[PDB]
Amino acid sequence: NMSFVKETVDKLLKGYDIRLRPDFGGPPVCVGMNIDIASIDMVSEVNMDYTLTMYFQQYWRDKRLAYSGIPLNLTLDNRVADQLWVPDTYFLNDKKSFVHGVTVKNRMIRLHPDGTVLYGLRITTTAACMMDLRRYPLDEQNCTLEIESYGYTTDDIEFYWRGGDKAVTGVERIELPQFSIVEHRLVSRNVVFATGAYPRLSLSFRLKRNIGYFILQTYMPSILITILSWVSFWINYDASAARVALGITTVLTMTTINTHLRETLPKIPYVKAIDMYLMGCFVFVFLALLEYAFVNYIFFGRDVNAIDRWSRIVFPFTFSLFNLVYWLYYV
Amino acid sequence: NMSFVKETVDKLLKGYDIRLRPDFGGPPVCVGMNIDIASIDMVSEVNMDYTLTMYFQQYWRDKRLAYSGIPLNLTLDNRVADQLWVPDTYFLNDKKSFVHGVTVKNRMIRLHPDGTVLYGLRITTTAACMMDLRRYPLDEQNCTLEIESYGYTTDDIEFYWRGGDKAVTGVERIELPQFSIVEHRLVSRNVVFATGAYPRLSLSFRLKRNIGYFILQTYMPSILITILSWVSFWINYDASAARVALGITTVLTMTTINTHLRETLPKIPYVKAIDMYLMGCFVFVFLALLEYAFVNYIFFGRDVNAIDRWSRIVFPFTFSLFNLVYWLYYV
Amino acid sequence: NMSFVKETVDKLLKGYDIRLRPDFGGPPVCVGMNIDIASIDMVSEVNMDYTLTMYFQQYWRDKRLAYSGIPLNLTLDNRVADQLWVPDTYFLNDKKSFVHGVTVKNRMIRLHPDGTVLYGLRITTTAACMMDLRRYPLDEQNCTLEIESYGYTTDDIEFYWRGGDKAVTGVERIELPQFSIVEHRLVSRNVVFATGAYPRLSLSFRLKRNIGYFILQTYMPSILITILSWVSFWINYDASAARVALGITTVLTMTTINTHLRETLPKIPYVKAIDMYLMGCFVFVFLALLEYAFVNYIFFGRDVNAIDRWSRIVFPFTFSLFNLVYWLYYV
Amino acid sequence: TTVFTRILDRLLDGYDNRLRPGLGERVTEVKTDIFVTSFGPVSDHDMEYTIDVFFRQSWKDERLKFKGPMTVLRLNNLMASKIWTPDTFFHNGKKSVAHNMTMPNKLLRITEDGTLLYTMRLTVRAECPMHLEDFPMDAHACPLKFGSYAYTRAEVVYEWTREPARSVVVAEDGSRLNQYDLLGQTVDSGIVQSSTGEYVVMTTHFHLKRKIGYFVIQTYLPCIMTVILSQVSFWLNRESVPARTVFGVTTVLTMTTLSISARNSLPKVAYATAMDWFIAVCYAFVFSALIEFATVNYFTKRGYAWDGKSKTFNSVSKIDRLSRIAFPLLFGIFNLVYWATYL
Amino acid sequence: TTVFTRILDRLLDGYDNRLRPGLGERVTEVKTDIFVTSFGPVSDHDMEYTIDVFFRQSWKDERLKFKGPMTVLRLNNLMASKIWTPDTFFHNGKKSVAHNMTMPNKLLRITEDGTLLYTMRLTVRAECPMHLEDFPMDAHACPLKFGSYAYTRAEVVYEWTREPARSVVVAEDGSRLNQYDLLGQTVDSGIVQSSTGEYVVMTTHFHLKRKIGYFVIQTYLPCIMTVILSQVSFWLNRESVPARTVFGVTTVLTMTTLSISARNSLPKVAYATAMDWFIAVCYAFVFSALIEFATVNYFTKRGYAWDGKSKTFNSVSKIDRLSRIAFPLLFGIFNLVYWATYL
C-alpha cells in the first residue's frame, strides 16, 4: 500500500524536532562514517590543495525515526533530508566544496525499521594540504582530510570509522599521472578548542611524486648543458672566439632554461630541491667560462696546458661527486 | 478551453506522491534516454576532462499522469517538474554540471495521453576523461559519459537507449579544433556493487588527434634545427669559431623550442611521444657539437677528416633510422 | 520599550505593497544617492573594465513608513529590506556585481520619523570602461559608472546627487598602483530608450597613467640596446665577425625584448604608442646591421671610411629626432 | 493604493502560469526586438563572443485585461515570476547572466488590452564557430539564435517587433571590440527541426572583420625583415665564414623566437592558419639562406679576403650572385601570391 | 527533548529578530574573539591576503533566559537565523565565504542567564595595502577591521573577550604562508566616523616579513654572477675583439633575460622596488662593460695578439687595467650600501 508508506513517513515528521540531536540531554549519539573515493581530480602545489570526489556516508541511529510494520528500507526523495536532523559534519581543511546537483542533488536518504539512518552525499571538495616542497620534485606529500563536528562536542556526538580499516574504499581507483598512492590511514581522535573538545576523524594519503617527467625535461637538459660546457676544456686556448662563444652561450642557455622552467613549474616562493640542482649546474657552467679566462690571463706572462688538462678531470669528477651527494641525499 | 486543462493538471497533481516511483512495489519502471549533442566546447588534457552541451531527454510512463479528453500533448511550464516525480539520474564521471537558466531554466516537461513523460534538460557538463597521453600528439582517446541511477537499484528502475543506435544525434555535426570524432558507441549494461545492481548507460566517443598542426609547429622546426647541426660537418675543422658558434646556437635553439613549446604540454608532468622526439632530437644536436670536440682535440697530434666524413653519413642515417622506429611505433 | 517598537514596525509592514513605488500614480519619487568609495581594485586593460568597492547609499522618502512616538532613528536588521520597496537601481556598464554577505549581507536599512529611508549597500562591481589605448602607456583614461533606473521612467522616479558635488567621498584616499586620479565629476541627466526616458547619474574618473614604471621597464632597455647597436660604427670594418655578432645579437635581443614584453603587457590587439616605439627602435638596430652590410659590400671594389664616420653622427641624431617627434606627439 | 492592490490581486486570482496563453486554441505569437547596449569582446580561443542586450519580448494575454485610472502598469519585476512568460533560450549560448544588481534587471509593463512588454538585461556568451584558415585575415558571422525550449511552432511562434533590419539595434557607443570591426548584421527567422518537434528560431548574424594592423607590426613585419635580414648575408663576402655562420644561425634563432610568440594569441587548432603558412615559408627562406652559405663555404678555396691594395683571391660566388636575385624575387612573388590570395 | 522543545518555543514566542537587544534602552555590548585556524596565502599582485578563522561573538540577550535541566543549550545552527545577530562585516574584506559543507559552519550556544556564544567558520580575503619600495626586503602590517555595518556606536559596541593580546589566537600548525613569516599581531580598538555616523571598529594587524631566500637564489645571485661575469671580459686581451664583443653582447642579453623574468612576480606598480634598483644598476654595469671595450677597441693599434715567442704588440690598455679595479670595487661598494640600506 503506497498510502500506508506515505502515512507512516508523515507521522514521523509531524512530531520531529530538528533543533535537537538524538538522545538530547543524554548519552552522545555515535555517527559512523565510511567513504567511497570516486576520484582525486587534481593535486595543486601552487594553491597547496587537492580536489577530492567521494561518496560520503554517515551512519547514526535516531530512535525518533524508528518505524514498524514496513519490512523495507525506505529510500526517500533527497528533499526529505531538509526535514531530518543530520550531523553538522564539516571538513576543517576544505577550501571549496559542493554537492553535485545534476540532474538532481546527489543525495541519498535510507531509513531502517530500528531508526538507523544511512545518509550519503556525493561531494567534490578542495581540501588544503600544506605541502613541504623542499625536496621537490623528489618529495613525498601527506594530504589529509579532517572530519569534525562544528557545534556538538564529545559530550553530544561521537565519530567512528564504519568497518574499521575497511571504512574507506576505492583507493585503488585513484589514477594520478603525477602521484602514486603509497599508503592511506584512518585516525580517530579528539581535538580540544576554547569552546570544548570535539571528535575528529582523519583520512590521510601519502603521495609519492613520479620523477620520470622531471628527469626527461629538467634534469637531463641541465646535465647535458653542463657536459656541453666541458667541451671548451678540449679546445685549444688560441681559439678565444670559439671558447668564449661556447662558454657565454651555455651560461645564457642555462639561464634561459631556469627563467623559462620556473614559468612552467609551480611557482612556489621558496627554494625547492631542483632549485638547488639548477643553481649548482649554473655554477659549473659559470666556473668553466671562468676557467678559460684564467688560462687566457696567464698564457701571456711566460703549465698553461696543465690547467686545461686538469679541468678535463676535475670538472667531470666534481660534477659526479656533486650528483652523488645530491642524489643520495634526496633519494 | 484552458479552464478544462487547468482542472486536468490540478487533478493529476492532487494526492500525487513525488517520493514514490511509478509502479512502486511492482515491475521496475523503464526509462528511455536519448541525447541531442548541441556542442562539445572544450577537451582539456591538463584537467583530463571535456565539456559537453546536450539536450538530455528521459522517457518513462507514469499511469498516474495519464489523461483523457484532450487530443494534445501537454507542454507545461518547466516549474511543473518540481511537482512531478523524475528519475534520480546523475552522470557518474562528471566533475561539474549545470542546467542553463537564461532566460528561464532550460527544462522541458511534455505529457502524453498514454501517460508517457518526456523530460528534457539542456545541460553543460564537464565529465572526467582519463586520457592516455603516451602517444601524444599522435594519440587516440576514448571519452565516456556514464549515466546511472543514484539511489534506485535495478529492482526499481531500468535504463535503455530510446531508438537503439539512433538515440544520440548531432555527433557528425560536431567540429573540434584539435580533435575529430571517429566514432561513437552506445552501451547498456548492469553494474553490481555491494549495495545492489544498478542500471548503466554509457556514451563513448573515439577522438583522433590531427597531426597536421604539430608537423608545422613542432616536428618540422625540430627537424630543420637537427639538419642545421649537420652543416657543421661540412665546415672546415680549422674554423673553430664558426663551427662552435653554429653548434652552440643550435643546441640553445633546441632548448628554446623545447622550453617555449605551448603545444608540447609543458604544464602537466607526463611522458609523451613528442617529449621523446624532442629529447631524441636534442641528443642528435648535442652529438654533432660533441663530434667536433673530438675532431678539434686530435688534429694537432696527428683520420681526422674521417670522423667528419663519417658524420656526414651516420648522423643523417641514424636520424632517419630514429624516425623510422619512432613513426612505426607511434603510427 | 521594545514591545512598543515591535508594534510600530509590525504595523508598518501590515498592508505594505512592495510592488508599488511611493506616490505610485502621482508625482515621481526623488531618490538621492551618495557614494563612499572604499577602494578601486584592478583597472584591467585586457577586460577593459575596473573593479569598484563602495558604500552605495540611496535616500528617498516613503510616507507609508512614517512613524510617530519614537524619538529614534530605527536601524533594523538588514533582512527587512526584502519586505520594503527599494528603487530598481542598476549599473548599466557593470559586468559582474555582488553584495558582500559575510558575516551577514552587507546591507543597511535606517528609518526616520518623517518617513525618510536610508538604504546602504556595500557593493563590489566590475564596470566596463572602453579605454582608448592608442597612446598607451602615455594615455589618460575616463572611466565612468552609470547609475540608472531599469523599469521606472522619469515620470516615476528622479535621481539626484545628495549633497551636490560632495555626494561622492573617498576619491582622494584611493591609491592605484598604475593610475592616479586627476579629477572626478558628477552628472545628472536623462537617457532616452525605446521604452521611455530614464534618469541617469554618472560618476566619472579621469585617470592619468604613471610613466615611471615604463621608463625603467620598457623604454630604457630599448634605448640602451639601440645605443649598443651604435658601437658597431666604432669597430673597424675588417672585423666582420665582431660587427655582425654585435648587430645580430642586438637585433635578436630587440625581438626577445619585444616578444617577451608583449607577454607581460595586456593583450591589446591593436597598435599602441609603445608598439610604435619598440618597432621604431627595431628599425634603428636593423639599419645599424644594414649599415655594415653596405660597408662590407664596397670596401672590396673601392667612401667606405666616410660611411662609417657619418653613421656615428646620423644615427644618434636621427634617433634623437625620432624621440623628439615621438615624445612631442604623445606627451 | 488599496484600489490598486485589488487590481493586482484580481489579475493573479485564478491565473495558471503553467498554461501558455490560448493553450489548445491558437498559436502564441511573441514579438521580440533586441537593443545591443554593448557588443562585448570576441574570444577566439573559446570560439565564443560576449554581448550585452536589452532583450524585449511582447505577446498578448487576454487573462491580464484590466480597467483602471492608468492604461499602462509599470510594475515591480517580481511580478514576472507570478505570471506566464515565454521560455526563451539562446541556442548557441554557453553561459548567460541575468544581472541582479541592485535588483533583478527586469521590467514588466501591462497594457490595458492585455499586451505585455517584458524586458531583461542579459550578458550572453554565445558560441561562434570560427574557421581560422585565413587567420589573421579572416571574417566571421557570429550568430545569435533564440527560441522556445519546450513549445513547438504549433504552440509558440516568434516574430520581430518591426522590420527585421530595424529590430536589432546597436548603441553608437556600444562597441567593446578591440581586434574586430562590426560591419553590420543580418536578421532572419526560420524553422529548426529537432527530435522533439519543429521550433521557430530567430537568427541574428553579426558580421565581424578582424583588424590586421596589430599583426603586421608584431609578426608580419619582423618576419619579413628577418627574412630580408637573413638575405643580407648574401651581400657579405664569402671569406667571412664565422661572420656569415653567425648571421645564418642567429636569424634562425630569431625566427624561432618570433614563431613561438605567434601561438600566444591563438586557440590550439589542429589545422594550419594563414599565418602558420607565412611563418613556415619564412622558415624555408631563412633555412635555405644558411644552406646557401654552406654550399658557398663548401667550394671556398681561400680563407683570406681581398687585401685592399691589389696572390689570388676568392671570386664572388655565382651561387651568391644569383641568390641576391633568386631569394628576394621568390620571396616577393610569394608575398604577392600570399597577400592577393587572402586580402 | 520534549521539555527542551517547549523551552525553545517559549523563547521564540513573541521574539523579534529585527530589533537589537535593549533597543532604545541601552547600548548592546558584543564581546568578540578570533581563533585563526590557518593564515592563508598573501597575494602581492592583488594586495590581499587570505585567512581562515573561527569568528566568535558574545553578547547578552535577556529575552533568551531559560530555566531547565541543563544550563547550556547547544542548538542547531539554523537557530541563529531565528534570533538577532550582530551585522558584523569586515571593512577591508574583498570576498569572504561562510562555509556550508556539509552544513552551515556555525554554532549557537545559549546560557541560562541569556549569554550567547555565536561562532562561524569563515574564509576572508581582506585588503592589505602594500608599499613595495623595499621589495623583496619589505615588511607589511596587514589589517583585519570589523564592526557593525548599520548600528552606530550608540547602539552596538564591540569589545574583546579577554586581554587584547590573548583575544586573537593563531593555531600552532595553522600557517599557510610560503614566502612570509608571521612575526606576531597587534590588537586595538577605536572609533571611525563615516557619512552615516560613528561606528566602533576592532582592528587586528598582522605583521609579515617576506623571506628573501627565494629571490637570492633566483634573481640576485644570477644578477651578481652575471655582473661579475661581465667584468671577466676585462681580463681578456684587447686583441680578441670578436671574443670580447660576443662576451659583452651576450651578457647584456643574459641580463635582459633575467631582467624580463624578474618582473613576472611583481604587480605593475608605478614606483621602483628595491629589486628594480638592483637590476637597473646591474644592467648599467653590463652595458658599461661593453662601452669600456668599445673605447679600448677604438684605440687598438694592432689586430694581432701576442705570439708567445718574444714586431711590436699592443700594450695592456690603461683603461682595461683600471677597469679591473673600479668595476669590481664600485659594484662591491654599491652592494654594501644597497644591502645595508634595506636589510
Ligand SMILES: *[C@@H]1O[C@H](CO)[C@@H](O[C@@H]2O[C@H](CO)[C@@H](O)[C@H](O[C@@H]3O[C@H](CO[C@H]4O[C@H](CO)[C@@H](O)[C@H](O)[C@@H]4O)[C@@H](O)[C@H](O[C@H]4O[C@H](CO)[C@@H](O)[C@H](O)[C@@H]4O)[C@@H]3O)[C@H]2NC(C)=O)[C@H](O)[C@H]1NC(C)=O
Ligand atoms: C551553500 O551555499 C550555496 C550558495 O552560496 C547554496 O546554493 C544555493 O542553495 C539554495 C538552497 O538550496 C538554492 O535555493 C540556490 O538556488 C539553487 O540553484 C541551483 C542552480 O544554481 C544555478 O542557479 C542559481 C539560481 O539562479 C544561481 O544562483 C547559481 O549561480 C547557478 O547559476 C539549482 O540547481 C537549485 O535547485 C534545487 O532546488 C530546487 C528547489 O525548488 C529544486 O527544484 C531543484 O531540483 C534543486 O534541488 C536551486 O535553485 C542555490 N544556489 C545559489 C544561491 O546560487 C548551497 O545549497 C549551500 N549548501 C548547503 C549544503 O547548504
Ligand SMILES: *[C@@H]1O[C@H](CO)[C@@H](O[C@@H]2O[C@H](CO)[C@@H](O[C@@H]3O[C@H](CO[C@H]4O[C@H](CO)[C@@H](O)[C@H](O)[C@@H]4O)[C@@H](O)[C@H](O[C@H]4O[C@H](CO)[C@@H](O)[C@H](O)[C@@H]4O)[C@@H]3O)[C@H](O)[C@H]2NC(C)=O)[C@H](O)[C@H]1NC(C)=O
Ligand atoms: C600525515 O600526518 C598526520 C599528522 O599530521 C599523521 O596522523 C597521525 O598518524 C599517527 C599514526 O601514524 C597517529 O598516531 C596514532 O594515534 C592514535 C589515536 O590517538 C588518539 O586517541 C588516543 C586514544 O585512542 C589518545 O590517547 C591520543 O591522545 C589521541 O587522541 C593512537 O591510538 C595510536 O597509538 C597506537 O600506537 C601506539 C604505539 O605507536 C600504542 O602505544 C597505542 O596503544 C596504539 O596502539 C597512535 O598514537 C597520530 O595521532 C596522527 N596525528 C594526527 C594529528 O592525526 C598521518 O598518519 C600522516 N599520514 C601518513 C600517510 O602517514
Ligand SMILES: *[C@@H]1O[C@H](CO)[C@@H](O[C@@H]2O[C@H](CO)[C@@H](O[C@@H]3O[C@H](CO[C@H]4O[C@H](CO)[C@@H](O)[C@H](O)[C@@H]4O)[C@@H](O)[C@H](O[C@H]4O[C@H](CO)[C@@H](O)[C@H](O)[C@@H]4O)[C@@H]3O)[C@H](O)[C@H]2NC(C)=O)[C@H](O)[C@H]1NC(C)=O
Ligand atoms: C571506451 O572504452 C569502454 C570500456 O572502458 C568501451 O565500452 C565497452 O564497449 C563494448 C562494445 O564495444 C561493450 O561490449 C558489449 O557489452 C554488452 C554488455 O555486456 C554486459 O551485459 C551482458 C549481458 O547483457 C553480460 O554478459 C556482460 O558480461 C556484461 O555485463 C554486450 O551486450 C555486448 O554484446 C555484443 O557483442 C557480443 C560479442 O562480444 C555479441 O554476442 C552481442 O550480440 C553484442 O553484439 C558487448 O559485449 C563493453 O561492455 C563496454 N564496456 C564498458 C565498461 O562499458 C567503449 O566501447 C569504448 N569506446 C569506444 C568508442 O570504443
Ligand SMILES: *[C@@H]1O[C@H](CO)[C@@H](O[C@@H]2O[C@H](CO)[C@@H](O[C@@H]3O[C@H](CO[C@H]4O[C@H](CO)[C@@H](O)[C@H](O)[C@@H]4O)[C@@H](O)[C@H](O[C@H]4O[C@H](CO)[C@@H](O)[C@H](O)[C@@H]4O)[C@@H]3O)[C@H](O)[C@H]2NC(C)=O)[C@H](O)[C@H]1NC(C)=O
Ligand atoms: C568622461 O566622458 C563623459 C562623456 O562620455 C563626460 O561626461 C560629460 O560631462 C559634461 C560635463 O563636464 C556633461 O555636460 C553637462 O551636462 C549637463 C547635463 O546635461 C543633461 O541635462 C540637460 C538639461 O539639464 C540637457 O539639456 C542635456 O541634453 C543632458 O540631458 C548640463 O547641465 C551641463 O550644462 C552646463 O555646461 C554647459 C557647457 O558645457 C553650459 O552651456 C550650461 O549652461 C551649463 O552650465 C553640461 O552640458 C556631459 O553631458 C557629459 N556627457 C555624458 C555622456 O554624460 C565626463 O565628464 C568625462 N569625465 C571627465 C573626468 O572629464
Ligand SMILES: CCCCCCCC(=O)OC[C@H](COP(=O)(O)O[C@@H]1[C@H](O)[C@H](O)[C@@H](OP(=O)(O)O)[C@H](OP(=O)(O)O)[C@H]1O)OC(=O)CCCCCCC
Ligand atoms: C639552396 C641552393 C643550393 C644550390 C647549390 C648549387 C651547387 C652547385 O651546383 O655549385 C656549382 C657552382 C659553384 O659556384 P661557386 O661560385 O659557388 O664556386 C666556384 C666554382 O667551384 C668554380 O668552378 C671555381 O672556379 P675554378 O674553375 O674551379 O677555378 C670557383 O673558384 P674561384 O674563382 O672562386 O677561386 C668557385 O668559387 O655553382 C653554380 O654553378 C651555380 C649554381 C646556382 C644555384 C642557384 C640556386 C638558387
Ligand SMILES: CCCCCCCC(=O)OC[C@H](COP(=O)(O)O[C@@H]1[C@H](O)[C@H](O)[C@@H](OP(=O)(O)O)[C@H](OP(=O)(O)O)[C@H]1O)OC(=O)CCCCCCC
Ligand atoms: C666608461 C668608460 C670611459 C672610458 C673613457 C676613455 C677616455 C680616453 O680617451 O681614454 C684613453 C686613455 C688611454 O687609453 P688606452 O690605454 O686604451 O690607449 C692607449 C693610448 O692611446 C696611448 O697613447 C697609446 O700609446 P702611444 O701614446 O700612441 O704610443 C696606446 O697604444 P699601444 O701602446 O697600446 O699600442 C693606447 O693603447 O685612457 C685613459 O687615460 C684612462 C682614463 C680612465 C678611464 C676609467 C674608466 C672607468
Ligand SMILES: *[C@@H]1O[C@H](CO)[C@@H](O[C@@H]2O[C@H](CO)[C@@H](O)[C@H](O)[C@H]2NC(C)=O)[C@H](O)[C@H]1NC(C)=O
Ligand atoms: C535493509 O538494510 C539492512 C542493513 O543493511 C539489511 O540487513 C542486512 O541484510 C543482509 C542480507 O543479505 C545480511 O547479509 C546482513 O547481515 C544484514 N545486516 C543487518 C545489520 O541486518 C536488510 O536486509 C535490508 N532490507 C531490505 C529489504 O533491503
